[PDB]
């Protein structure tokens, strides 16, 4: 793998062989990401940012779960056909202060990435959310909460899946994307000044 | 870039004459999540807002049933500039065919006609304030905030008449490469995930 990727894997325990999916407590939410660049940035820097309204929903869930159970986030990129990983929410939302020229977010919270692996939606499409009109979990919108029993089923399948690919297969590609976009925006800013 | 040429063959951008003194119409701020969205919008003459944002624009367009135009003032989140103006040209389509226009990144689409493609810094506009957004500057608006018609005329006049030094057109090959390289990655991921 890419050498930065080598050290990221070294510092974290991605895709653990033993993960407790039969949660006694917790809250679980779907994250519908706009792009794989967000996911790549999220894994590299251990942070997430939803919309303004999604941030408020997740922040409130985290604060009502204080020292009482995990908040897990199940990640899927819009249009990708796959779930791409799982992280735990680890801080409240900090709405604090170049968001555009460096393509960062207008706020952030800490996440601990746990699973980084592509799971086809057809592997999960059979699980239905009674609190979303019994639609399949794979048709959820961003920050949809998953009832705990259904979340347990989804987490067992993602943890046990023997994936053939993950966003890590394109690590250098997403590094180059981010770098080139940052130069482009900096230049565009410069000329406008 | 050639695609930029096929576009200029079909449309004329930044007209030297544009009526900014609107007799009628409704005008909305559009806040884009990225430059990639802006590039895709200019290329395929489409847009898609949030679910809530689509309902607001759809209702507005259907209510303006030829009585007047619906203009969209575009700004990428965090950018410090506005980057163009388009006219909304259709209602929202949520159909099955809608997704192919965005490779399923968007839940749907509606047609737009881009008119101005030019970077206009917020400091040319921050003095225009919105009595329907608590008198905040028009440049601190959120996605699909409606602009009162008189204030919209002021904004449209400054955008039309501003001597811009750059536009997203100047990065067009960049965003073309971004779209193809990404699409290659997407196909390869899907292939490798079929066994």
From Swiss-Prot, chain B:
Ubiquitinated by the CUL7-FBXW8 E3 ligase complex leading to degradation. Deubiquitinated and stabilized by USP5 by removing 'Lys-11'-linked polyubiquitination. Changing residue 33 to A: Strongly reduced binding to N6-methyladenosine (m6A)-containing RNAs. Changing residue 142 to A: Reduced binding to N6-methyladenosine (m6A)-containing RNAs. Signal peptide: none annotated. It is found in: Cytoplasm; Cytoplasm, P-body; Cytoplasm, Stress granule. It comes from the Eukaryota. Residues 25-159 form the YTH domain. RNA binds at residues 31-33, 37, 47-48, 77, 101, 106. The disordered regions have the ability to interact with each other and to 'phase separate' into liquid droplets within the cytosol following binding to mRNAs containing multiple m6A-modified residues. This leads to the partition of m6A-containing mRNAs into membraneless compartments, where mRNAs may be stored, degraded or used to transport mRNAs to dendritic arbors in neurons. Belongs to the YTHDF family. YTHDF1 subfamily. Specifically recognizes and binds N6-methyladenosine (m6A)-containing mRNAs, and regulates their stability. M6A is a modification present at internal sites of mRNAs and some non-coding RNAs and plays a role in mRNA stability and processing. Acts as a regulator of mRNA stability by promoting degradation of m6A-containing mRNAs via interaction with the CCR4-NOT complex. The YTHDF paralogs (YTHDF1, YTHDF2 and YTHDF3) shares m6A-containing mRNAs targets and act redundantly to mediate mRNA degradation and cellular differentiation. Interacts with CNOT1; promoting recruitment of the CCR4-NOT complex. Interacts with ribosomes. Interacts with eIF3 (EIF3A or EIF3B). Interacts with YTHDF3. This is YTH domain-containing family protein 1. The gene is YTHDF1.
């Amino acid at each position: 793998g890419h050498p930065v990727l080598e050290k990221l894997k070294a510092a974290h325990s991605y895709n653990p062989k033993e993960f407790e999916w039969n949660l006694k407590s917790g809250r679980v939410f779907i994250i519908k990401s706009y792009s794989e660049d967000d996911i790549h940035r999220s894994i590299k820097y251990s942070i997430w940012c939803s919309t303004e309204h999604g941030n408020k929903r997740l922040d409130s869930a985290f604060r009502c779960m204080s020292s009482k159970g995990p908040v897990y986030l199940l990640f899927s990129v819009n249009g990708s056909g796959h779930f791409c990983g799982v992280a735990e929410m680890k801080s409240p939302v900090d709405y604090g202060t170049g968001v555009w020229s460096q393509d960062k977010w207008k706020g952030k919270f800490d996440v601990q990435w746990i699973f980084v692996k592509d799971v086809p939606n057809n592997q999960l499409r059979h699980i239905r959310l009674e609190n979303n009109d019994n639609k399949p979990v794979t048709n959820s919108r961003d920050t949809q909460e998953v009832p705990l029993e259904k979340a347990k089923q989804v987490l067992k399948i993602i943890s046990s899946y023997k994936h053939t690919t993950s966003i890590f297969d394109d690590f250098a590609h997403y590094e180059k994307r981010q770098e080139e976009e940052e130069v482009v925006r900096k230049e565009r800013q410069s000329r406008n000044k």
